[PDB]
Curated annotation (Swiss-Prot), chain B:
Glycosylation sites: 21, 34
Originating gene: S
Function: Attaches the virion to the cell membrane by interacting with host receptor, initiating the infection. The major receptor is host ACE2. When S2/S2' has been cleaved, binding to the receptor triggers direct fusion at the cell membrane. When S2/S2' has not been cleaved, binding to the receptor results in internalization of the virus by endocytosis using host TFRC and GRM2 and leading to fusion of the virion membrane with the host endosomal membrane. Alternatively, may use NRP1/NRP2 and integrin as entry receptors.
Name of the protein in its database record: Spike protein S1
Assembly and binders: Binds to host ACE2. RBD also interacts with the N-linked glycan on 'Asn-90' of ACE2. Cleavage of S generates a polybasic C-terminal sequence on S1 that binds to host Neuropilin-1 (NRP1) and Neuropilin-2 (NRP2) receptors. Interacts with host integrin alpha-5/beta-1 (ITGA5:ITGB1) and with ACE2 in complex with integrin alpha-5/beta-1 (ITGA5:ITGB1). May interact via cytoplasmic c-terminus with M protein. May interact (via N-terminus) with host bilirubin and biliverdin, thereby preventing antibody binding to the SARS-CoV-2 spike NTD via an allosteric mechanism.
Taxonomic superkingdom: Viruses
Length: 49, 38
């Protein structure tokens, strides 16, 4: 029976932009889209432990 | 001559704080990097 998973953390600025500074100014125009993802990933990581 | 490239040093930065009510001392934690690199 599986009880745990892989604690995966996804960086939005490294996944979407990666190495572009011009696109980094456009991510702040959408609001807290990255905050919800980071909070969900942190919650999953805490739930696994 | 073939030169192998490697991405820059990056990772998650987490601040280990015991709460602002007790003390203001904090500790940084650089995830996924060695101590020889900043
Ligand atoms: C610390 O917690 C106590 C009890 O909850 C509270 O009375 C006090 O105001 C808090 N201190 C700060 C700086 O928030
Ligand atoms: C950091 O570098 C040292 C020296 O090469 C190595 O022994 C150690 O395993 C490295 N740390 C990690 C987490 O791999």
């Amino acid at each position: 029976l599986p009880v745990s998973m892989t604690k995966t953390s996804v960086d939005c600025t490294m996944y979407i932009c990666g190495d572009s500074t011009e696109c980094s100014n456009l991510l702040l125009q959408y609001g807290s889209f990255c905050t919800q993802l980071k909070r969900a990933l942190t919650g999953i990581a805490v739930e696994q432990d | 001559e073939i030169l192998d490239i490697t991405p820059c040093s990056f990772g998650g930065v987490s601040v280990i704080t015991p709460g602002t009510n007790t003390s203001n001392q904090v500790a940084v934690l650089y995830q996924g990097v060695n101590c020889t690199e900043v």
